[PDB]
Design a protein around this ligand. Structure first.
Ligand SMILES: Nc1ncnc2c1ncn2[C@@H]1O[C@H](COP(=O)(O)OP(=O)(O)NP(=O)(O)O)[C@@H](O)[C@H]1O
Ligand SMILES: Nc1ncnc2c1ncn2[C@@H]1O[C@H](COP(=O)(O)OP(=O)(O)NP(=O)(O)O)[C@@H](O)[C@H]1O
Ligand SMILES: O=C1CCCN[C@@H]1CCCn1cnc2cc(F)c(Cl)cc2c1=O
Ligand SMILES: O=C1CCCN[C@@H]1CCCn1cnc2cc(F)c(Cl)cc2c1=O
Ligand SMILES: [Cl-]
Ligand SMILES: [Mg+2]
Ligand SMILES: [Mg+2]
Ligand SMILES: [Mg+2]
Ligand SMILES: [Mg+2]
Lengths: 479, 476
C-alpha cells in the first residue's frame, strides 16, 4: 500500500504510486522504464481514441525506419542524439542515428511523393518510440530517454488548410486529456522563444501540477509554414501550372499523458483511474470466510458480471483463492479501479451488493436490478467529478497579475502567472535569468499565450518592460 | 504498370509490385524500407486480429525498453547486434544494444515479479520493432534489418499448461495466415538442428513460395522448458512451500507475413489483396473524362459503408477510367465498381473482381449483399488456389536419389527421416555441393499432419528405421 503522502514528499508519493499499482518497473538503463500491463492498457485506450479520431480526418498510419544516416540528420539538439556505431565488433562504414523525431526521415520521401495538387493534402501519422538522451532529470512517463508517441506530419496546398488541421489536431489533444483522462488543459500559442524553431507557429495544450507548481506541455501542434518545404524541396504544381511550396504541420503527444493523469487524480491511497480509460471499471470481490456459502456467492458474481457487460461495463471478478478479501480491497484500490463491488453472505440474502467508489470512498447499497444503470451513473459521476475538481485546482493555481513584483511571491505559492506582456525577444530570457537569480536564495518561462484572452484595457503596460502590452501570457516553473 | 512476369523474373516482379502499388518506399539505410499506408493498413489488420485473440487468452500487453546493457545481453548471434556507443559527442560508460529480441530485457523482470504459485501463469506480449544486422541479402518484408513484430513470453507452473499455450498460439498463427491473409501453412515441429537452442521444443508454421521453390518460416512458437528459468533464476514457491522452476513459452511473428501474402496471391498485373485485410475492398470508378455520376457514387459509397465495406471513390481529374482500372489492379483492390452514364441510365453497376477478372451486372439495391458474397468468394478462392499450389509443390519421396530432381522442379520434399542430428548436417552439405554443380536443402519441419508410415519404412538417407516424415526444401 502507498504510505508517502501526496502533499508531503511529492516525488516519493509518485514513485510509490506507480510502482505499487504495478504500472512501472525500474530498469538498469537510466531514464528508461518498463511499462507493465496496468499502465500499458491505459495507453491503449487513449491510443485507440486518438487513432480513431485522426482516421475520420483522412490521416493514414505508416511506419518509417528508426534509423537516419549521419549526413541526413546533420542538415541545440545535437547532445540528445543516440548514435549506433557498430554491429557486433564491426564498425559501421558510417555511424547511424536512432530517431529523436522523424522530419529528416519522412521529408525526403515527401519531396519524392508530392508532384501536383492531386497529391495533396498528404496526411500521415506513426505510432512508434523515439530516443532522446535527455539532460534533465528523468521521470517515469513525463520525461524518459525512450518514449512512446505518435507523430503526425501533413502537407497541404494552402496555409489556411494546414492551419485548420493544426487546430483540429489540437482540439483532439484537448479531448485526449479532458475527455479521456479528465485532465484540464489550456490551449495556447508558444512564444517566439519556446516555439519549434523549424516552424511558423507552435500551438500547445498545457497542464498544471499543483503539488510542485509546475506547468507541463501536454501535447503540441505546429503550423510549419513552408520552411521545411524549401529545405527538402517539397513542391507541387498548382491548378495553373506553376511550382508552389507545400504548407506543412506536425504534431505529437506521448506517454507523458499518463504521468499527467496519475499526478492529477491520484490520492494518498494511490491511483485513481478515470472510468473512460480504466481497463477494469468494476471489480467484483466475493467475500469468503469459514466456508460460508462459497458456491452461491461465486454463482451470483458470474451472473452479475454478464448483466453488467450487456451495458458495456468492463468488469473483473477477482475470484483468486490465494488472497484475502481485504488484500483484494487494498490491491484494486492502489490500482485505482473506479468501483469495487463487494458480495458476502449478508448481501446475498438481501438481493443487494455494496459498492464503493474509489474517488471519494462513498459506499452504496444497491439492488441487483438497479446495478447497471446505477453503476453507469456513478461512472459518469466519477469521470465528471475528477475533471471538475482538477479544473478548480487548475484555476486556484493561476494568478492574474500586473507587475513583476507580483511574480516571485506567486511562484512561492506554487502558482503560475497570467500577466500582460509585450512579446519581444529579449524579455523572456531576461525574465528567466532574473527569476533564476532570485529563486536561488528555479526559472520561470512562458508556458503559452492562451487562445482565450481576457480583455486588455487600453494603455495597459507589459509587466516587466513597462512598454505597451499586447496579450496575456501564462508563465511559471515547468517540466 | 507491372511489366516483369511473375513466373519468369520473380525478383523483379516482387520489387515492381511492392513499389508500384505504393506499399514500400526505398531507403538509404540497407535492409530498411518505408512502409506506406497501403502496406501498413494490412499490418494493422493482422495486429488487431492477433491482439484480440491473445487478449481472450489472458495475455496482456506491455512495453519493455528497446535498450539492453552489454552486461545483461551477454549473460552465434553476436554479429547481428547493433550497438549504441555515444550520445551526441559524449561516449557512454558502456555500449548499449538495440533489442534483437527481448529475453535478456524481460526475464530478469520475470525473476523479480514471480515469487509464488499464485503469481502464475504470467502472460505478456509486446508489439515493437526489433533490429538485427542480417548477414543475408535484405528483402522487403521477408528479411529486413529493422522489422515490426509481436513477441509473447509466458511462464507457467507446469509443462503441460505451457505446452497447451504453445499450441494455442500456433493455432493463432495459422489463423493469422490462413484466415486473414489467405495463405496456407503447415504446422510442424522443428528438428534439433533448427529449433531455438534456448528451448526444449520449437513449433512452427511453414509456407511455400512456388515461383522460387523455397520454404519459409511463417511464425514460431517455443516450449522453452525450464532452462531460462534456471538461467535467470525464475522460481516460485509451490503450495507446499517448495522452490520450483517456471515452465515457459515464447513466440513471435513479423511483417514477413505481409511479404508471404504478396507473393502468394500476386499475378502479372500486380498485387491481389485478400478482402479481409485490404485498406480498400471496393474502389468505385466513375466513367468520366455535372454531379450526376459523382452524386450517385457518393450515394453508393454511403450504402456500402453501412454494410462495413471499405470503399474509396477514385474521382481524380486528369486520368482516364482505363488508367484508373490499371492503377487499382496493381494495388490489388479486390473489387472494382464501374459507374458510367449507361449504368446511371439503367440503375445498375458493373463489378469486376480482381482475382479472376469476372464481371457482374448488379442492381443498386443488390450491391451490398452481392459484394459481401463476392468478397467471401474471393477470400476463399485465393486460399483454396494457394492451398492447391502448396500441395502440388510437395513431392513425397523414399530415397536420396529423388532429392535433386525434386529440388530442380522447385518443389519441397517430404521424406521419411530417422531424425538423427548429424544426418541433417550431412544432407545440408551433400545438397549444397550437388547444387553447385542458398542451394542447400534443410529441414523445414516435422508436420503434425503425418502421412501414413508403412511398417518397416527406412530413412531416405541413412537407411535406418524411419520415425516420421520430415518436410525439407531450399528456404529463406
Ligand atoms: N523526454 C520526453 N519524454 C516523454 N514525453 C516527452 C519527452 N519530451 C517531450 N515529450 C512530449 O512530446 C511532446 C512533443 O515533443 P517535442 O515537441 O519534440 O518536445 P520538446 O520540444 O523536446 N519539449 P522540451 O524537451 O520540454 O524542451 C512534448 O510537448 C511533450 O509533451
Ligand atoms: N530479418 C527479419 N525480418 C523480419 N522478420 C524476420 C526476420 N528474420 C526472421 N523473421 C521472422 O520472425 C520470426 C521469429 O524470429 P526468430 O524465430 O527469432 O528468427 P530466426 O530464428 O533468427 N530465423 P532465421 O534468421 O531465418 O535463422 C521468424 O520465424 C521469422 O518468420
Ligand atoms: O513537436 C514536435 C514533435 C514531433 C514532430 N516534430 C516536432 C518538433 C520536434 C522538435 N525536436 C525535439 N527534440 C529533438 C531532439 C533531437 F535530438 C533532434 Cl535531432 C531534433 C529534435 C527536434 O527537432
Ligand atoms: O524465436 C524467437 C523470436 C521471438 C521470441 N524470442 C525467440 C528467440 C529468438 C532467437 N533469436 C534470433 N535472433 C537473435 C539475434 C541476436 F542478435 C541475438 Cl543476441 C539473439 C537472437 C535470438 O535469440
Ligand atoms: Cl482499447
Ligand atoms: Mg526536448
Ligand atoms: Mg524547450
Ligand atoms: Mg535470424
Ligand atoms: Mg535459423
Amino acid at each position: 500500500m502507498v504510505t508517502a503522502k501526496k502533499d508531503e514528499n511529492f516525488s516519493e508519493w509518485y514513485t510509490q504510486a506507480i510502482v505499487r499499482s504495478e504500472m512501472i518497473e525500474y530498469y538498469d538503463i537510466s531514464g528508461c522504464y518498463i511499462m507493465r500491463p496496468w499502465a500499458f492498457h491505459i495507453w491503449e485506450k487513449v491510443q485507440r481514441f486518438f487513432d480513431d479520431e485522426i482516421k475520420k480526418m483522412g490521416v493514414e498510419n505508416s511506419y518509417f525506419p528508426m534509423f537516419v544516416s549521419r549526413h541526413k540528420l546533420e542538415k541545440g539538439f545535437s547532445p540528445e542524439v543516440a548514435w549506433v556505431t557498430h554491429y557486433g565488433d564491426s564498425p559501421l562504414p558510417e555511424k547511424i542515428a536512432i530517431r529523436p523525431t522523424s522530419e529528416t526521415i519522412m521529408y525526403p520521401a515527401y519531396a519524392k511523393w508530392i508532384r501536383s495538387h492531386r497529391d495533396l493534402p498528404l496526411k500521415l501519422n506513426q505510432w512508434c518510440s523515439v530516443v532522446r538522451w535527455e539532460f534533465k532529470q528523468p521521470t517515469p512517463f513525463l520525461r524518459t530517454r525512450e518514449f512512446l508517441w505518435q507523430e503526425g506530419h501533413t502537407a497541404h496546398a494552402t496555409e489556411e488548410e494546414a492551419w485548420e488541421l493544426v487546430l483540429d489536431i489540437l482540439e483532439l489533444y484537448r479531448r485526449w486529456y479532458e475527455e479521456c483522462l479528465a485532465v484540464p488543459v489550456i490551449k495556447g500559442e508558444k512564444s517566439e522563444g519556446e516555439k519549434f524553431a523549424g516552424g511558423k507557429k507552435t500551438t500547445t495544450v498545457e497542464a498544471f501540477i499543483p503539488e510542485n507548481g509546475r506547468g507541463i506541455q501536454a501535447a503540441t501542434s505546429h503550423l510549419l509554414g513552408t520552411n521545411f518545404a524549401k529545405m527538402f524541396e517539397i513542391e507541387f504544381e498548382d491548378e495553373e501550372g506553376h511550382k508552389r511550396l507545400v504548407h506543412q504541420t506536425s504534431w505529437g503527444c506521448t506517454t507523458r499523458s499518463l504521468g499527467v493523469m496519475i499526478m492529477t487524480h491520484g490520492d494518498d491511497k494511490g491511483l485513481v483511474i478515470p472510468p473512460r480509460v480504466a481497463s477494469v471499471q468494476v471489480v467484483i470481490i466475493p467475500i469468503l470466510f469459514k466456508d460460508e456459502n462459497t458456491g452461491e456467492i461465486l454463482g451470483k458474481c458470474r451472473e452479475l458480471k454478464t448483466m453488467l457487460e450487456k451495458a458495456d461495463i468492463r468488469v473483473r471478478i477477482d475470484d483468486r483463492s490465494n488472497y484475502t478479501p481485504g488484500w483484494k480491497y487494498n490491491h484494486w484500490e492502489v490500482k485505482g479501479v473506479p468501483l469495487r463491488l463487494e458480495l458476502g453472505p449478508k448481501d446475498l440474502a438481501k438481493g443487494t451488493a455494496r459498492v464503493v467508489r474509489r474517488d471519494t470512498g462513498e459506499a452504496y447499497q444497491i439492488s441487483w436490478a438497479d446495478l447497471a444503470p446505477k453503476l453507469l451513473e456513478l461512472m459518469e459521476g466519477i469521470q465528471r467529478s475528477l475533471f471538475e475538481k482538477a479544473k478548480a485546482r487548475l484555476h486556484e493555481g493561476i494568478e492574474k497579475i500586473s507587475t513583476f513584483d507580483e511574480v516571485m511571491p506567486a511562484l512561492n505559492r506554487k502558482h503560475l502567472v497570467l500577466a500582460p506582456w509585450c512579446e519581444d525577444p529579449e524579455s523572456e530570457e531576461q525574465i528567466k535569468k532574473e527569476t533564476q537569480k532570485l529563486s536561488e536564495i528555479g526559472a520561470m518561462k512562458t508556458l503559452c499565450i492562451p487562445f482565450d484572452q481576457p480583455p486588455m484595457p487600453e494603455g495597459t503596460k507589459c509587466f516587466y518592460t513597462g512598454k505597451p502590452a499586447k496579450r496575456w501570457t501564462l508563465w511559471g516553473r515547468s517540466y
